């Protein structure tokens, strides 16, 4: 017989959640991968056939929950409620038996070698799941953009991650990361968005704010330029608009939020920015190489929508590397899911014949099984 | 002396068959409940589905326009009730299949259906998991068709429910 | 099974008149693969050659002014395929004639295409062994322009290749 064998995506890099079945191009869920429980007694009074509120329901739910991000960086910190971020993801957001169904997963870069086999081990022993990969994140979009050979960049939402790969191998002497993207750019915007006197706090807001975040804001191709160009302009300033039918205005808040991703010097560290640490990563890179490296800057996640970013990373890298040299950047269209889209791409192929990572296998092999079913 | 109603588990064997996915070339079109009522007893001590239509995916090539567009031609003015939809929207961003939770308590029915459907209304919303969203709804003007219904859902990713483009 | 595609033996038939030479009086002109074209099976399961212009050291003189350019007019414009090539350069020091694989896969090509393929890199380059440079092929115009065969080794040949100037 035949049937759309329905196998299961999942995909968390920098604590933004995506899940779907192989094939799709669009997720059927995304999330934060946020879980809270009570402080005391349930959302409404007595117990309910669950009290614990994953992403959505922990983000809606005010006064009454204790939280975690079971990955509060670029690392996961914690496995016990990663666990039921991804029963939740299965049972509640894809509506999915995984007892049956094959798992394509993602481990996030720059993850502790166990951090895949404590993966693994969850699917197998917890899930049950009779098939299984896991891939790095990185390659997947390298693979959807068109390399197998490159450097990747993450900025899905608690870190950038900066990701150099010769033929599906991650660099590990030169792989880099730079703990702030998307998520603290949204607290950022608020703490600019003080300036105009609005007294942000609640999620019921962080939810405006993520929505100016995706809709309204733009990296500066010249900071100085924009700021110009904005002040000879008979409008800069705008107004937003929440859905109750009340007001907001935004105006330079647009471009001062993602400037401090090219210079976290603004915002206060003293780390480089996306494309310092971008040619940091390159130039430890092996001399062979680097040359390659320069022309293949793939540019995923959900920080890499705002306008001129990538234009910007072009303009900026340029002044970086040797002249003589020619840089080339590339930003896919559903640039925000493309690690996830070539999971899916992955989730779909049946060729198991040079894998063997099953529940028979994995009682023999244990949960280092995933380090002795790839060459 | 305040007794309250309780949900039996008839409704959550309804629920879960309607709740979970199966096989997509067929038991996804016609092994999925798209709609359904649930109803207060004559007794009044418990929460039961009946007759009230249950419709299915693939009824869209058999009968209607979509299943909950016909629910919605089906409703009872003069009663309150609980209902459970399975929205599907659409775009290139998500495929959003939701399981959403429906007060119907219309304007037009009584004081003594409702404040017992009413009472009861939170204790069949903690038996169901895996609903994303809830209506309090009261009367057919708020339910009248997809696009008052997508708002209710909200976001800006309801750029089609149902089949129907918005 | 979330597995990439399997090649077998079937493209080591056609890569045995590259990893290997004849003698240059008859057999080489009659024998050597200059270019030849893979393809990812339907199925979805494994790359097989794709029986479209297999190029030589004959067909050269009758029409072909060089290998790849009669190549670069198949090679389809928006979808992803492998390719080898037998490269014939002159350098300082060295006549070279070397094997070189080709991946192509176009900027504009589908990403559910790109992923699939550009997986098998590992599994073809494991069994196209004996190969000495790579060719990424980014699209046409990419490699129309016959110096950047030169460059795509390296550029470091500097006198003749394919029989033109370089």
Redesign the interface.
Same mark, same amino acid.
Not at chain 2, 91 to 97: A, F, G, P, V
Not at chain 2, 125 to 130: A, E, R, S
């Given at each position: 017989d035949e049937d759309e064998t329905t196998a299961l995506v999942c995909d968390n890099g920098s604590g933004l959640v995506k899940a779907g079945f192989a094939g799709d191009d669009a997720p059927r869920a995304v999330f934060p991968s946020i879980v809270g429980r009570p402080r005391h007694q349930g959302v409404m009074v007595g117990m309910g056939q669950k009290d614990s509120y994953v992403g959505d329901e922990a983000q809606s739910k005010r006064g009454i929950l204790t939280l975690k991000y079971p990955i509060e960086h670029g690392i996961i910190t914690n496995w016990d409620d990663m666990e039921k971020i991804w029963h939740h993801t299965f049972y509640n957001e894809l509506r999915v038996a995984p007892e049956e169904h094959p798992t394509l997963l993602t481990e996030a870069p720059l993850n502790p070698k166990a951090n895949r086999e404590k993966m693994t081990q969850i699917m197998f022993e917890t899930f049950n799941v009779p098939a299984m990969y896991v891939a790095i994140q990185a390659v997947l979009s390298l693979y959807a953009s068109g390399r197998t050979t490159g450097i990747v960049l993450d900025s899905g939402d608690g870190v950038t991650h900066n990701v150099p790969i010769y033929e599906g191998y991650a660099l590990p002497h030169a792989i880099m990361r730079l703990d702030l993207a998307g998520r603290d750019l949204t607290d950022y915007l608020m703490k600019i968005l003080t300036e105009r006197g609005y007294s942000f706090v609640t999620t019921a807001e962080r939810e405006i704010v993520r929505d100016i975040k995706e809709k309204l804001c733009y990296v500066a191709l010249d900071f100085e330029n924009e700021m110009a160009t904005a002040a000879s302009s008979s409008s800069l300033e705008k107004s937003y608009e929440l859905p109750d039918g009340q007001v907001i205005t935004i105006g330079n808040e647009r471009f001062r939020c993602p400037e401090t991703l090219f210079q976290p010097s603004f915002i206060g560290m003293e780390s480089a920015g996306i494309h310092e640490t971008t040619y940091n990563s390159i130039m430890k890179c092996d001399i062979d190489i680097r040359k390659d490296l320069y022309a293949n800057n793939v540019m995923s996640g959900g920080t890499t929508m705002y306008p001129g970013i990538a234009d910007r990373m072009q303009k900026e890298i340029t002044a970086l590397a040797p002249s003589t040299m020619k840089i080339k950047i590339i930003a896919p269209p559903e640039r925000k899911y493309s690690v996830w889209i070539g999971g899916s791409i992955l989730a779909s192929l049946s060729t198991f014949q040079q894998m063997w990572i099953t529940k028979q296998e994995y009682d023999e092999a244990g949960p280092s099984i995933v380090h002795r079913k790839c060459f | 002396m305040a007794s309250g109603v309780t949900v039996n588990d008839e409704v959550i064997k309804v629920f879960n068959d309607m #709740?979970?996915?199966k $096989?997509?070339?067929?038991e996804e079109i016609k092994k999925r409940k798209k709609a359904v009522l649930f109803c207060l007893s004559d007794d009044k001590r418990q929460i039961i589905v009946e007759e009230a239509k249950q419709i299915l995916v693939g009824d869209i090539g058999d009968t209607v326009e979509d299943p909950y567009t016909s629910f919605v031609k089906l409703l009872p003015l003069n009663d309150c009730r609980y209902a459970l939809y399975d929205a599907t929207y659409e775009?290139? *961003? $998500? #495929?959003? *299949?939701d399981?959403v939770f429906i007060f119907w308590a219309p304007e037009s029915a009584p004081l003594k259906s409702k404040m017992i459907y009413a009472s009861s209304k939170?204790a069949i919303?903690? #038996?169901?998991? !895996?609903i #994303?969203h809830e209506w309090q709804v009261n009367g057919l003007d708020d339910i009248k068709d997809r696009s008052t219904l997508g708002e209710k859902l !909200?976001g800006?990713v309801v750029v089609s429910l149902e089949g129907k483009p918005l």
């Open positions: - | #709740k979970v996915r $096989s997509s070339t067929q775009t290139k *961003e $998500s #495929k959003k *299949e399981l939170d919303k903690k #038996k169901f998991t !895996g #994303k !909200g800006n």
